[PDB]
Design a protein around this ligand. Sequence first.
Ligand code: HEM
Length: 291
Amino acid sequence: LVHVASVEKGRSYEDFQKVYNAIALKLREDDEYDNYIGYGPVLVRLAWHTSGTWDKHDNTGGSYGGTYRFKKEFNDPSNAGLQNGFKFLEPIHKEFPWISSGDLFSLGGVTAVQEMQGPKIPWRCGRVDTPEDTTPDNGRLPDADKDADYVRTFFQRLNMNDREVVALMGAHALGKTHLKNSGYEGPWGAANNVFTNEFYLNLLNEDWKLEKNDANNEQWDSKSGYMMLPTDYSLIQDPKYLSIVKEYANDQDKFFKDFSKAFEKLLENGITFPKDAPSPFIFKTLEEQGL
Ligand code: HEM
């Protein structure tokens, strides 16, 4: 099955910049969410989970069809808490009803990363909503209680290599685990709504202890009040991941560049862009626009 990108009729960069801006302005406005973390992190997670169902072997799942809007996928236990992101986007979709659901979910992640001072993420339009029977079954998103070998094998299904995996996981600078959603509790760092390379710094520099949380799951905790999932900590247990963690801990620009490429790729997996499709858009931040 081939999914061909189809530009929303008559739309161009300026239309999508308006959608970006609306998302960005609402991120600014609804600042109190999650003890003043704001909605940036959950929007990044929503873009990832809506994209991360993809299977390279048969082109099922992925961002194209926007299938999170259907109950099988929004009720996936792996997606617990993302309803907050969807609720955020509802008034955006109401105002801009012409954008596809996949375009909105993916654009929400791009907008969040950029507004949180992250790298620019080129973004392409043209995802098309697909019907309810195209919704992927639950169980394609990764488990957190696993090791490096699991992580590496998992991400092969998304056509990601070691460098891409380690770069993508740097998104765990953002937000936190919430016990009621995932069975894990705590933030990965201190700057919970600013996109930086802090995840890698904390992995290497904190003193981590393997503890059980209140849901009876193991997680790595530091005296600073940070946590790492077992899959996060596996990036410093595996010698190939560890070298890349050290690289990104020591080179903010490199992390930004590599993240941007991997995150665009994640959001585009499964989609065929025609030769004459528009080039990727690079949206201006609110700050860049003086807004
Ligand atoms: C082995 C891979 C991964 C595992 C097992 C994993 C697991 C988790 C878990 C358990 C949570 C907490 C959810 C909650 O309790 O609210 C979470 C949150 C989050 N994940 Fe990951 N994740 C992975 C990869 C990624 C990737 C690739 C990205 C994006 C590039 C990402 C972005 C986020 C963000 C931003 C949050 C914070 C959400 C919030 O604060 O509401 N994750 N992840």
